[PDB]
Amino acid sequence: FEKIQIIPKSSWSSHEASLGVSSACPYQGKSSFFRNVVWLIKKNSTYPTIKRSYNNTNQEDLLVLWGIHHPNDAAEQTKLYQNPTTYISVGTSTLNQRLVPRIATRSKVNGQSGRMEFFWTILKPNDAINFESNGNFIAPEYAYKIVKKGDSTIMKSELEYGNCN
Amino acid sequence: NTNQEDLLVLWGIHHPNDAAEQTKLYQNPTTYISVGTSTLNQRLVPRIATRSKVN
Ligand SMILES: *[C@@H]1O[C@H](CO)[C@@H](O[C@@H]2O[C@H](CO)[C@@H](O)[C@H](O)[C@H]2NC(C)=O)[C@H](O)[C@H]1NC(C)=O
Ligand SMILES: *[C@H]1O[C@H](CO)[C@@H](O[C@@H]2O[C@H](CO)[C@@H](O)[C@H](O)[C@H]2NC(C)=O)[C@H](O)[C@H]1NC(C)=O
């Protein structure tokens, strides 16, 4: 198990990855966001269609995580992005999805009203994941190398480690 | 079902690689496939997305 750079924060030149946070996740007081997935915003006032991908040069197996930002209303659609209708599609040897963001009146939680649906699959050692997005999207920065053998579970306990065996 | 024994049917959907192959095979941009039975009730839209090649 180890963390890996798939596509850095730097590589998004056509889209604004810097100020992609909100009043919800405080790092050192100041407003932050999930440090392993980047939230994409329009540049100047136009949102280019993204179309990038990742072949797995690594020989260990890995998994990717991504998601969708669901807005509160059609007014917040045109504030963050410059699109009315949006599509996010992901493609791998196995996977085949086409996700549309849902717009609906919510209730407020931890500040922000709209939701954030995440997704995942495991990418084979010698295969490519392909993305395509019009907007309303949160792309991976980091992803994990997994070598799985055998299963267990999530034990629910209050205790802490006792340096034994 | 004129037959008196019970039966099952199979069908599916072709998902294209891009909007260019949409207009090559078929002459439609948006497409719908709907199936209806006493129980079943579905409306299937083909997903377009960049894939990897297999076979
Ligand atoms: C994933 O990345 C690598 C990029 O090099 C590909 O690996 C080789 O590609 C060659 C040339 O077409 C093929 O003979 C084999 O698939 C690999 N062979 C050797 C000798 O290295 C790989 O095909 C890419 N695959 C996908 C699905 O993206
Ligand atoms: C967004 O704003 C920028 C301003 O910096 C626009 O860029 C300029 O466009 C005008 C009209 O052609 C000219 O001053 C130059 O061609 C560009 N200026 C520079 C400094 O490069 C930009 O056109 C606007 N974006 C869009 C998509 O229209």
Side-chain angles (χ1 to χ4, degrees), chain A residues 5-13 15-21 32-40 52 140-142:
Chain A
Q5 278 265 359
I6 278 58
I7 42 160
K9 194 171 283 187
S10 324
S11 71
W12 298 115
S13 49
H15 306 81
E16 291 278 12
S18 185
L19 287 164
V21 306
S32 188
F33 183 71
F34 290 116
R35 296 163 94 264
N36 283 17
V37 61
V38 188
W39 195 6
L40 301 187
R52 295 180 65 175
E141 195 179 351
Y142 295 106

Side-chain angles (χ1 to χ4, degrees), chain A residues 89 91 93 96 98 127 130 132, chain B residues 15 47-52:
Chain A
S89 79
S93 36
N96 184 45
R98 182 94 179 172
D127 199 276
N130 303 295
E132 193 178 303
Chain B
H15 295 283
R47 306 179 197 77
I48 315 94
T50 313
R51 315 290 157 72
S52 20

Side-chain angles (χ1 to χ4, degrees), chain A residues 120 146-155:
Chain A
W120 65 278
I146 293 287
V147 168
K148 183 160 189 68
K149 278 165 90 193
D151 294 91
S152 69
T153 199
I154 296 90
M155 189 173 68

